[model samples]
Target chain A: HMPRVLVTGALGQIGTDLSLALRDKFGADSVLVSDVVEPGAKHPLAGLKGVEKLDCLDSNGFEKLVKEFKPTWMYHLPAIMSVRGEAEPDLAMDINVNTTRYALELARKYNIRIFIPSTIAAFGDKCGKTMTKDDTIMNPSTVYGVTKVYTELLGTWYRQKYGVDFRSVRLPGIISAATLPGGGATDYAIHMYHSALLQKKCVCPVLPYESLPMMYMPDTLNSLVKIMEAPLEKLTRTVYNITGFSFSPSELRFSIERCTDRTIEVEYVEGPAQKIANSWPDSLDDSNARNDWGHQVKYDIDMMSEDMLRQIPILHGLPSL
Target chain B: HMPRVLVTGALGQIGTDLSLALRDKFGADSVLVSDVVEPGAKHPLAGLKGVEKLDCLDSNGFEKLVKEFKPTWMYHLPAIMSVRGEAEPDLAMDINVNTTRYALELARKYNIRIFIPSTIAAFGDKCGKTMTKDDTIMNPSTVYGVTKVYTELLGTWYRQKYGVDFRSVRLPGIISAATLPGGGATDYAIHMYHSALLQKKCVCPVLPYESLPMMYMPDTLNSLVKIMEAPLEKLTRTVYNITGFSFSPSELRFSIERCTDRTIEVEYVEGPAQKIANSWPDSLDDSNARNDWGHQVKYDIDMMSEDMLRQIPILHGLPSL
Candidate 1:
């Protein structure tokens, strides 16, 4: 069967890039990019062969779309991200937990290969400082983290009980020049770069000394596809941790300066984002992903900074930094 | 203010005992026992001060109950346990996850001290053989385990985000003489004692050497009251691990023979319950519970077996052994 793919939350930060990547791998017609938001005429995803409005919480709507498209693979990306989730924890719970539950049911019934993206938000104060293990103490402090953990466990349950091909990646903060960062604790990491490109100074949301794991969007998109394509027997876990690099706001600022030859003033303002960021591990140990599925990363802090400085300005129709 | 306590799942194994304990602590008039099950004339819980039909899944009904009673505390105990949960996973999900979500919302709105009971189901193959830590890799294989983990994380999220005084206990297998075992993986432990009193031969559902943590009803009830009465400042974590003993089917049979003159015939018939039981820890490390709230157990395997022979017969209107 030619892989018919359905991508939910396809207009969000990672979803936007992930949709295109899926289209590239398995023809534009085979991949359906969907979200609650309708893309404009000029938007890249609007030109896709199969694009539809989907509210993941609406079981009937989700089921109807699934039956109509008959997607053999589903990438469920719809979620209320960290910052926004904390703001409206109840709504976040409704969206993240309920939607994932519905998606799991649909995938089980259809026998589809389903991919649910987890986040570093799933880890909390329980993980170690340097490299948190694949299976460590997880006590997520945010509504977003709570729901991600819910998604991970629910996927595992479906896989064991229903024999569905359910896979997930515990993603770090994804950085990209293609789109702006969504509402997440790690948004400041991406925001710092935009500050250097678009403005003179940015007040970082987390403490300068607090470190967090991050991934370049290209590597994140690659990991999603690679994990899904991996043979079922090779998967040691339902969710695998994947980290590209780890850094603080200050380190991110310094790297941007080195790449752009510009000084961007930065200040720290600790708030809910800081509390959420502090709850996560400084870095993740992704040996399981590496050993099982040949998961590899191509971007470091310096490489990511250089690319961000070059492309973000081009996307905005401005001179390169 | 006089403590107005509401107990859901009042007809279930622990709930039947827990309601009486709550009434003893805070008076029968203050403690309202409720469940979806309508009690017959001889039902133990039917004699309580307040016996109401409460379906936790009914949001409107739940809201009305909360509004009318204005409960100071809620012991949300309604759940579809492991053996039954595996049979109807979707209904289990609805009753366990969705109902808890509703309870949390009502408690948050009312500022009620809510206690949701977790289970040994929260721990899985990922935990250590002898001592499962309070916060370990929670990868539950059963639908019941999946929902318990969901409850634990959701409780943590509510406590962190809304400051809703949410508390939970990661309960081991509870053995009781007050009531027959409900549909749970550990039902075999309760069944073994009943077999000696009620029948001559008992076909055990698990292997003879599959050790799992367990607790007598007395200790389980004591822990609930002790934790609730404990100073709020003393609690380091929302969910606590509590265990009284760890024994296999053969060990339980041996204990039963030691306590009683009757010889109980037993044969292993490993099934879904055995799989669920084997997946859990041999014992739980409840040092956190011990240190934080002085959690103490009053019974061991021998003591539990002796009491079961003595009291369970009386409940069934039979003379004690």
Candidate 2:
């Protein structure tokens, strides 16, 4: 049977591309997308066929959406990332935890399989530095990581308790070409590419040499689809670790210069996100994801840099190098 | 420079004793105890000095309590335990998480040294079985454990972020002679002793041979006092592991029979708590607690058995063991 999907936070960084990808995979009419904003707003996802406004905490509207859509799969993504979460922890906690909770309840009631993303931010300063596994010490430092870990555990509980088909992947910094990133620790990675395109300079938020796990947007999209489509029996756990590449600001600078033929001055400012970035894993082990459901990525640092640089200019209607 | 203590869930199993302990350490008028209900409910802690109604989520009321009392330290303990948390997850999440969140916020504002409780339930099926350290994989199966892990991370986050002087201990099943155990996975341990005294027969809710970490009530009180009083610089982490003993139902039954000198029928019913009990650790390594803050327990299983049996009769005005 063809899949009908429902998505929340469809205007956010991952959501913008994710919504487009879902429509491409399924039909445009077959997938319904929403943010907390009203329908027909100027947001990218607003023009979609089944677009609707969704306040995640409103039980009346949330129930109406799922009941009307009858979606077999729900990609729930409305959340505050690491950087903003520290400043607005109360908002972060409400949106990150309760929205996922509401979605899980809807999934349990309606028999809809759900995929919400967890992150390497969920792994704090204490875990193994490089190639962190799915099951590791997850005492996260940031409120974002704390909420993410809560959702992961909550989703797992729903899976075990009520047989809800809850799926999550510990996502890395997603480097997308189309939309700008929200408040994430690795916003610097995406910022570097945008800076290389618009101006010839990028002010890195984190330390230049602090490494973190990252993935290209296309690869992230593919990982979601692959994991959601895998057989239920084949999936050993509700959450899996998935990554494409690991790079620091210096490596990305080198990639941008080499791939795009753009020489950008990269300055390390060491912003508030540095401590949070430092707490994250340098890399993650996605072997379980690969073994269970063929999790694979097609982009290296150079490839992502080239693709992003090329795509960013074209999308913005600028001269392509 | 005397310590002024404020307690939430000051009427619960731990709180009942904790309120009394805090009053004894500080003066009776120095500590203020409260739960969600109105004051003077004839609960064990109702007769205490400065008792007031405290709805944890009521922002105004919570702040008002801190302002009125001007507490130097807060022992926040209102929570939903494992057994009930499975049945009422939403309620558990609301109370366990938000109450602690409120307390942390209050602590940050008032510069109050706050103590909230995390449980062995914080450790899930994924963690090491024996010698579970302070830092470990915490993918708890139940909503109780899920919320507990959240508070632990939340408290730790507050400590690092706001310097809230947040303190917690990953507590085991606490056995108290005065009050009945709440809806924890190890409620069966406390139930066995009560049943032995009342009807001379105990119906074990969990399996007879599931070993879980436990502590007598007095030891639990000491651990709290020790951790809260330890030099701030000498203490390394926000949370510590503290356990008095480890015992299976069979071991407890044997100890009860040997100590109380009474033969009681032991029936293993294998209820819903069995899975939760099995998921917890057999024993926790509290060496860090010992090393950091001089955590010491006077009671082993047999000693706890003898003391509980002796104390139960006097508390109830029945024949002494």
Candidate 3:
């Protein structure tokens, strides 16, 4: 029998696509998707196979659901995105810390193999200019950063003491045409394609030179699947550094211009997102992911842009002129 | 009129002595000592001065006491010791974080100058061999360490945001002859002296050649008073890295021999307390304390030993032959 898989945050950008991908690979009934919101009850992931609501904050509910499902493999990917976290620090902190705590407790109790999706936000101002080892000075500034750092620490602690089989990916911005970006700061980079495809006029108002890491959704899903299946001994670190693509708005615009038929109008609006973007690494050195679990990038900046523009229109049922 | 000084953790090792010292300096009427204990109907402070039972956990009761006292200064010195923290991590975390939150909230509301007594426990194993500077990686290992580290961060946040004046000292192993040491791992070090002076037999259980930074009670009290009195700008950091004297148990034993004519037999019975002490620093570079506030040490090892033998007998109401 195939391993029963549980995906928390299974309706999110990665989760929505991941659940379907898991279903396609493992069989429809074998994959179970969970989120704070009921799956298939909301957008995109609705009507997907084996989608269930898993509110990580409700510890009892989570324990009950996990117990009933008894999944051998669990993708614990519930977290608040960066911008919303900055906007609401307290709620973000509560959600981030408590959710992970509950999930770890559940996993520990059930002896379930868990996969946690960590983020670059875990690297704070304390981490000078570069991403070092999993063990580094994590003095995070934002609530998102604080929570991510705390989650990683908690994950490490649980894994060490309880021997909970926990895995993670410190993901950069993941870009995908199959699914839309949520309210993340990097969403504008993803949404720029939809605007260009629909109106044939892209008036991108975010900071022009702003650059941050990005990933094609397929690559992200593929990386998750690969890491999930990788041999236990091959994983040197519980937290894997997943690499795919990183690009600035101008870099993306240039990449878009390379493949698109229509001219797009993009403007640089005076804002703080650019500053946030500038602070983040344009490209992360994910050598650890490559070495540990053989992490490979399927999409470069140009390929990802082409794939986005090509795949998004096709998925959206855009007519060819 | 001298402002009323309120001391929390009054029955605690530091609090017990600090209360008396404050009473002596500011007159018995001006010093208010409070603890979690039930207040006596005719307590010394009740009729002559003011004393209120304080539950730091109960924000309402804590605030009510603060409101009633209307004290000019608050000394927040309540926290779980290191050894107890190891046994109950969550409780340690809650006790440390909750009390500080309550204290900060009250200080913010009352616009009171708050004195937070931080500990060297905040410096974690990640702080490396020699701990220095405010810019250190503080991933505390112990539950007490976690609480202290969190409290320090909260203290900084409170001071910066609310403009509440906060003065703190990251104290080492505080040796006092007045009150017996509490549940702290360093308690044995202090109690050994008492045992040697009163019982005349010392079985030293601390690790061989494992030294820790030490501070006499008089020096500790003076350090707090000095930090509180100094202009805010002079204290470049609210958390002062104060150093007094560094000594191993053997050194402490030798000092004890000099004080008492009868040489006490010393034995090493390695205990759980030794494990906690092993993780701490042998000495600290407190240049910031010296440079910023001109912190100077008064009592060396010999002086402290001399004072302890001379005073403990008199304080205990025994004739000092």
Candidate 4:
């Protein structure tokens, strides 16, 4: 039987494509999409057989949703982004951990494979250049990091201590053309595309020296799907760190200019997102993903710029450069 | 006017002594002892005047108690000890951070000075070897470490973000002969002393090589008093790393043997305390404490051992050694 999959945060950046990929691979009838947001606001999960509005935070509601579906696999991605997390930390804590606890408990009650998306936020003020391994130092400074750290620990505990098939990936900043920009520290990269297309100059909030790890939407989906499909024996760590390209704003602007033949004027504004991005790792050590899961990236900064230029302008209804 | 002081975890080791000192310094009528555990326990604070029951979890009850007492200063020591916290991680998180939040908010509203104790547990696993300065890596593996890290960040936030008079000492293992040892990782050091005098051999549960920084009761009390009394201008860091003699079980046994002629045998056993102790710092850098508040230590292992032998025997109704 095709694996029955349920996607939380299914209307999200990765979700919009991942859900479609799940349907295409596992039969359209096998994929289900659920989110806390309104159905109108949810991404086009029309191709899938199942779609529902479900708030995972409300334990009873989540339990009911999972019971009705009885999914073999769950892509649990409901979380507060880094930028919003900093604005209201207490609320972020609630959204990040409480919902995951409910999800983990639900997964335990019914035998189900759970996949959570951890982020670079898990590394805190202590992370160095080349960002250390899984066992390396993790000093999460923000509520987002605290939640991610707790989730990683919880995932590990559930697997080792309680025998649960929990899987995760420490996702780099993901840029997408399908969905609107999410409220994360890396959301600006998506927004910058629109500004580059409309106004010849885009004010990049990132500093000149600031280089960050990022992934194209295709790479993000591929990483998640590859991990989900990879044999259990191939996994070194349940939570694998994955990355594609590392580039500064200047490097990105240069890529955009090369692609579009127009100078995208970049100005560094010290916004809340910029401050949060500043706290995160410039680049992560993603060797675990390569060695254990046979993970490989198709897009470098140059290739991603081409993909972004091709897709982003079309998605935003702007003339294709 | 005499300073009105409130102490949470007042029946605890440091709290017991601090309450007594507060009473002596600021009349008996001015000091209030608050703890989840009721009074009339083994500690002298039980028999002392002005003892009140306070479960820090109960915010309303705590606020009511504080309002009734009208204390200008509050020393919050209500936390699940590191050993007990390992067994009960969730409770530790609740007890550690929730109570702190409850206190922080109440103090912020009422304009009260809050003195908190952050432990050496705040340091990461590898930190024990290098013992980083004020700005080093901190990847606290245990739940206790997580709470301590949160408390430090929260204390700083309360001070800088909220502009509250919040002071903290990231203390090492504190030894006291007066109060019976609680279930802490470092309680073995305190327990070994009592066992050394009373028994021919000490059946130690923790390994002999598990070294950590520790201090005498007098030094601990003096440090607290000094930090609490320091002018706000002189107090630089909200949380200051505290220093004490660092020793493993074997090394500490040598100190005990020198203190008395008794032959003390040490045997390592599998115990939970050892696991918790393994998660903490072996040595800590505390220049901030000395630089900020003129903090000084008066007791080493020998002096503290002498003090312990002199007092504990009489209190236990045995002949003083």
- Give the TM-score of each candidate: 0.96, 0.94, 0.83, 0.88
DockQ each candidate and list the results: 0.80, 0.84, 0.29, 0.22
* Model 3 backbone overlap count: 2
Candidate 2 interface RMSD (Å): 0.8
What TM value does model 2 have? Answer: 0.94
What tens-digit string does per-residue lDDT give for candidate 2 at A5-88?
A: 998988787788888888988888889988887644555665556777789989779989899889999999998888888889
Off by over 4 Å in 1: A181-183, B47-49, B181-183, B318-320
Per-candidate TM-score, first chain only? 0.96, 0.95, 0.91, 0.94
lDDT of 3 by residue, B56-129 (tens): 88888888888887878889988887788667755665577667767887888898889887777766666664
TM-score of chain B of 1: 0.96
Question: Which 10 residues in a row give candidate 2 chain A its minimum summed lDDT?
Answer: A39-48
lDDT of 2 by residue, B1-321 (tens): 678988888767788888888778888888888888754455566555677777888879999989988999899988888888888888898899777788899999999999988989888777898898888888788888888888988888999889999988998888887765555577888778887787566778889889999999998988888888887987888888888889899999899888767877889998888988899999999998898889999989888888888888877655565
Quick one: how many clashes does candidate 1 have?
Answer: 0
Judged by DockQ cut-offs, is candidate 2 incorrect, acceptable, medium or high? high
**Local accuracy of candidate 1 as per-residue lDDT tens digits, B170-257:** 9888888766554468788777877888756788888999998898989999999888878789999899998998998899999998
Instruction: Spell out the clash pairs found in candidate 4.
Output: A201-A265
Q: What's the distance in Å from true for residue A106, model 1?
A: 1.0
Clashing pairs in 2: none
Instruction: Please give, for residues A121-154, the per-residue lDDT of candidate 4 as tens digits.
Output: 8776567746556655565656677678767766
Which one is best on lDDT? Answer: 1
Residue B227 of model 2 has an lDDT of 89
